[PDB]
């Protein structure tokens, strides 16, 4: 009477510690009941490998916790998928990327940054890159023990000290006296739940402006940088415009637009704050996207720096009509609507096996016997993916 459809799809990304283990649910409905088959990135199918992979009731695939000696790449680093099929057809769920991370020691360091008196200084906590995605900066702590980043999910921007949403610590108006203060960043492993203070203690090395200098970027000997950053909706972006000069310069921010060589000034309102040489955007919407330009000027000259912004939006899919009934030889239309950002590509599948059709909507001239089954619109960007399905019957 009805084909298979996923009631609950597995999530895009599952990251878990060897100590933690993991569980992934897949359930689809229809009649007569669909099977539930776990499938690898390519094809074939999923077996149980005791102590590592098991399938429980409800059709849930579980990875129990394991000791480091038992780690296997083809198991733990693999990208999986769920398959549900009945007599009417088959449907594959969205791609499920599984990465297990065996618990290991690591140390976080806050290195010093060099700055001229006044202006603004910014200190970053240096986190090993390979662990970088599993660890986030929570707060910062000075010699007297003050927590600058520990209050609220949003920080007051009008004070001397501000902990940026990027985890980085921003300081307005560096004085000669504050150089005697040292700071430590606290990090927390999202899986283990362990918190640890930074190993080394960072400090500000302050150079006295005994002579004037143009704006100087972080690069050396003709080195510029274009930082392309992405942040999800409702989150908070931070745009960096690192510089040092004397006399202390002023930072004017601008925004390019689609296919333009020009720009316009940026709105400074309560939604989007600016602080010194750094711009913060709270409650990021999708329209905050597009090429941004920071320009630093003073009496002796000026320079600009480019940073581009793309706001991630959750992908989705809907096929219409969900269930279609068409005669023999008569065409039928499946249009796939979707919501999200960005979208790199869109695929199509018939009964679990993929077609080469790259367009959002697809057509069929004359309905034949082979044209009955389950179809799916696969929309995937580089970082994610999502899908829906539809049924077609003959009459």
Ligand X SMILES: *[C@@H]1O[C@H](CO)[C@@H](O[C@@H]2O[C@H](CO)[C@@H](O)[C@H](O)[C@H]2NC(C)=O)[C@H](O)[C@H]1NC(C)=O
Ligand Y SMILES: *[C@@H]1O[C@H](CO)[C@@H](O[C@@H]2O[C@H](CO)[C@@H](O[C@@H]3O[C@H](CO)[C@@H](O)[C@H](O)[C@@H]3O)[C@H](O)[C@H]2NC(C)=O)[C@H](O)[C@H]1NC(C)=O
Kindly list the residues in this chain that would bind ligand X in the complex (CB under 6 A). Answer: 295, 297, 302-304
Q: Which residues bind ligand Y (CB under 6 A)?
A: 18-19, 65, 67-68, 102-105, 295, 297, 302-304, 345
Quote the Cα angle for 281-170-124, to 5°: 105
The footprint of a second copy on residues 129-168 (CB under 8 A) is 129-130, 132-133, 136, 166
Partner in contact with 67, chosen from a second copy, ligand Y, ligand X, none, beta carbon below 5 to 8 Å by kind: ligand Y
Indicate the SS3 state at residue 133. Answer: helix
Question: In this structure, how many other beta carbons lie within 10 angstroms of the beta carbon of residue 314?
Answer: 12
User: 302: which strand partners?
Assistant: 297
Partner in contact with 345, chosen from ligand X, ligand Y, a second copy, none, beta carbon below 5 to 8 Å by kind: ligand Y
The footprint of a second copy on residues 194-213 (CB under 8 A) is 200, 205, 207-208, 210-213
Question: In this complex, which beta carbon is closest to ligand X, that of residue 92 or of residue 305?
Answer: 305
Question: In this complex, which beta carbon is closest to a second copy, that of residue 103 or of residue 157?
Answer: 103
User: 329: which strand partners?
Assistant: none
The footprint of a second copy on residues 297-336 (CB under 8 A) is 299-300
Contact criterion met (CB below 8 Å) for 29 and 5: yes
Each residue 88-117 as x (binds a second copy by CB under 8 A) or -, in order, gives -----------xxxx-xxxx-x-xx-x-x-
Judged by CB under 8 A, the number of residues near a second copy is 60
Tell me the backbone φ, ψ of residue 58, rounded to 5 degrees.
80, -5
Q: Is the peptide bond before 321 cis (omega within 30 degrees of 0)?
A: yes
Question: In this complex, which beta carbon is closest to ligand Y, that of residue 7 or of residue 62?
Answer: 62
Contact criterion met (CB below 8 Å) for 14 and 24: yes
Q: How far is the CB of 382 from ligand X (least distance, A)?
A: 6
Q: Which are the contacts of 336, defined by CB distance < 8 A and separation ≥ 6? A: 317, 318, 319, 320, 346, 360, 361, 377, 379, 388
C-alpha 164/C-alpha 377 separation (Å) is 39
**Selection from 12, 164, 150 nearest residue 81 by Cα:** 12
| Unique residue bearing structure tokens 């829906």 | 388
Q: How far is the CB of 345 from ligand X (least distance, A)?
A: 9
**Selection from 311, 317, 327, 292 nearest residue 385 by Cα:** 317
- Interface with a second copy, residue 226, by CB under 8 A: yes
Among 217, 275, 332, 346, binds a second copy (CB under 8 A): 217
Side-chain half-sphere exposure of 388, counting CA atoms within 13 A? 18
Interacting span for a second copy (CB under 8 A) from 29-37, 138-146, 220-228, 331-339: 220-228
In the complex, the residues that contact a second copy under the rule CB under 8 A are 18, 68, 71, 73, 76-77, 99-102, 104-107, 109, 111-112, 114, 116, 126-130, 132-133, 136, 166, 200, 205, 207-208, 210-214, 216-231, 242-245, 299-300, 383
């Amino acid at each position: 009477q009805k084909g298979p459809v996923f009631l609950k799809e597995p999530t895009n990304r599952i990251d878990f510690s060897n100590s933690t283990g993991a569980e992934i649910e897949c359930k689809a409905s229809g009649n007569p009941m669909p099977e539930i088959i776990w499938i690898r990135s390519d094809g074939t199918a999923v077996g149980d490998v005791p102590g590592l992979r098991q399938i429980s009731s409800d059709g849930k695939l579980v990875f129990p916790p394991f000791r480091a000696e038992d780690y296997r790449q083809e198991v733990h680093a693999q990208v999986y998928a769920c398959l549900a099929r009945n007599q009417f057809g088959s449907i594959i769920s969205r791609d499920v990327h599984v990465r297990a991370v065996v618990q290991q020691f690591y140390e976080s360091e806050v290195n010093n940054e060099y700055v001229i008196r006044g202006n603004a200084a910014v200190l970053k906590c240096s986190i090993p890159s390979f662990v970088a995605d599993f660890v986030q900066v929570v707060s910062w702590q000075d010699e007297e023990g003050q927590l600058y980043g520990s209050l609220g999910d949003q920080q007051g921007t009008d004070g001397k000290y501000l902990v940026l949403p990027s985890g980085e610590l921003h300081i307005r108006e560096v004085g000669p006296e504050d150089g005697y203060k040292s700071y430590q960043c606290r990090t927390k492993h999202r899986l283990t739940g362990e918190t640890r203070l930074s190993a080394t203690k960072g400090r500000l090395v302050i150079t006295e402006p005994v002579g004037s200098v143009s704006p100087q970027l972080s690069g050396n000997g003709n080195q510029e940088h274009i930082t392309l950053t992405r942040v999800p909706k409702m989150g908070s972006v931070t745009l960096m415009c690192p510089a040092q000069a004397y006399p202390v310069p002023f930072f004017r921010w601008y925004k390019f637009i689609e296919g333009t060589t020009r720009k316009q000034a940026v709105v400074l309102n309560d939604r989007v704050k600016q602080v010194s040489g750094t711009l913060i955007i709270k409650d990021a919407v999708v329209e905050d996207s597009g090429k941004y330009l920071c320009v630093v000027n003073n009496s002796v000259g000026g320079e600009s720096v480019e940073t581009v912004l793309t706001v991630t939006a959750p992908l989705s899919a809907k096929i219409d009509p969900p269930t279609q009934t068409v005669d023999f030889g008569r065409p039928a239309v499946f249009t796939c609507q979707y919501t999200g950002n960005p979208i790199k590509t869109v695929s199509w599948m018939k009964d679990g096996k993929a077609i080469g059709h790259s367009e959002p909507v697809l057509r069929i001239e004359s309905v034949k016997k082979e044209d009955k089954g389950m179809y799916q619109c696969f929309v995937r960007n580089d970082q994610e993916s999502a899908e829906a399905s539809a049924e077609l019957k003959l009459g």
